Amino acid sequence: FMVSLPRMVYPQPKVLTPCRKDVLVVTPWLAPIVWEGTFNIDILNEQFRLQNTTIGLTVFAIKKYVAFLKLFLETAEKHFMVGHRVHYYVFTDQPAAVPRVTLGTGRQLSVLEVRAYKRWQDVSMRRMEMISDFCERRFLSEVDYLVCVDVDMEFRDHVGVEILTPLFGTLHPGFYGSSREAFTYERRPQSQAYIPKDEGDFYYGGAFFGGSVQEVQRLTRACHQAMMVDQANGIEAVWHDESHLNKYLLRHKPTKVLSPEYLWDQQLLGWPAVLRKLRFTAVPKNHQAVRNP
């Protein structure tokens, strides 16, 4: 914990030059918004390697979504926390369908067998319960941070220790330039996910969040308990786990926010100038086909 950095030679920070002139790089509660140009990865790598950091990555591959694992894991090997200790946790109803992907040194993979729900909405929402539960089973004793992502994705560029913090969310790529009234929060007061039209900082994506194990256990437990209240009341939030994630992060502000570099869809949104890197991207899929037998 008490550990000195070695001597390093790198460019001097420039106090009187903004690191970005086109985007917000800090939230109003002083959380960094992580864009390329904001960080020197050499300094961050040193800080996190000196603390012997282990990062857990959770991914759900239930029913037909096992098809996405090979690309997901291959590309994670090229781009996700390279040089750091990584533990992948693949949650699936089909252990035998997990592809045999070759891992770099210091990286391991565990297959966690879980039930499949019929409705895609329930598969998506029940990730919160399943993550919270495994926080006691394994994660508290095995990793320092958890990164919780969608599987229908691939890494195309660096995703590293710059994201690590007690609690982070990611700007949804559909909404980063939108006004809060256009955000697709849950708007029915009868749901635990309700956010009024005059509230909201950002629209966070359900496909990429994380933090310390303690903060992720808190978040996932809270979202699951809220879902259960909604279920008892006969209501399902408009965007499922993402709606609840958004309510949680409004009331418990994240300590870093990831830019849409970290959660993108090039088919739908192209490659705008404001994105210097496209790091973690959607794999094209046919919702109706892939979500049903």
Ligand X SMILES: O=c1ccn([C@@H]2O[C@H](COP(=O)(O)OP(=O)(O)O)[C@@H](O)[C@H]2O)c(=O)[nH]1
Site for a second copy (CB under 8 A): how many residues?
Answer: 54
- Residues facing 146 on adjacent strands: 56, 211
Q: Does 123 contact ligand X by CB under 6 A?
A: yes
Binding mask 189-228 for ligand X (x = CB under 6 A): ------------------x---------------------
14 binds, among a second copy, ligand X, Mn ion, none (CB under 5 to 8 A by kind): a second copy
120 binds, among a second copy, ligand X, Mn ion, none (CB under 5 to 8 A by kind): ligand X
CA angle 166, 176, 31 (to 5 degrees): 30
Is the Cβ of residue 168 or residue 239 nearer to ligand X in the bound state?
Answer: 239
Contact yes or no for 62/92 (Cβ under 8 A): yes
Q: Does 189 contact a second copy by CB under 8 A?
A: no
d(CA 229, CA 218): 17
- The contact set with Mn ion (CB under 5 A) reads 150, 152
Annotated catalytic residue 242: yes
DSSP output for 176-197: TTS-GGGS--B--TTSTTB--T
Q: Quick one: which segment of 24-32, 64-72, 112-120, 129-137 binds a second copy (CB under 8 A)? A: 24-32
Contact yes or no for 239/255 (Cβ under 8 A): no
Binding residues: 60-62, 65, 150-152, 172, 184, 242, 265
- Residues facing 168 on adjacent strands: 210, 256
Is the Cβ of residue 31 or residue 237 nearer to ligand X in the bound state?
Answer: 237
The alpha carbons of the chain give a radius of gyration, in whole angstroms, of 19
Q: Does 186 contact ligand X by CB under 6 A?
A: no
Site for ligand X (CB under 6 A): how many residues?
Answer: 13
Nearest alpha-carbon partner for 68 in 285, 260, 288, 254: 285
Q: Does 61 contact ligand X by CB under 6 A?
A: yes
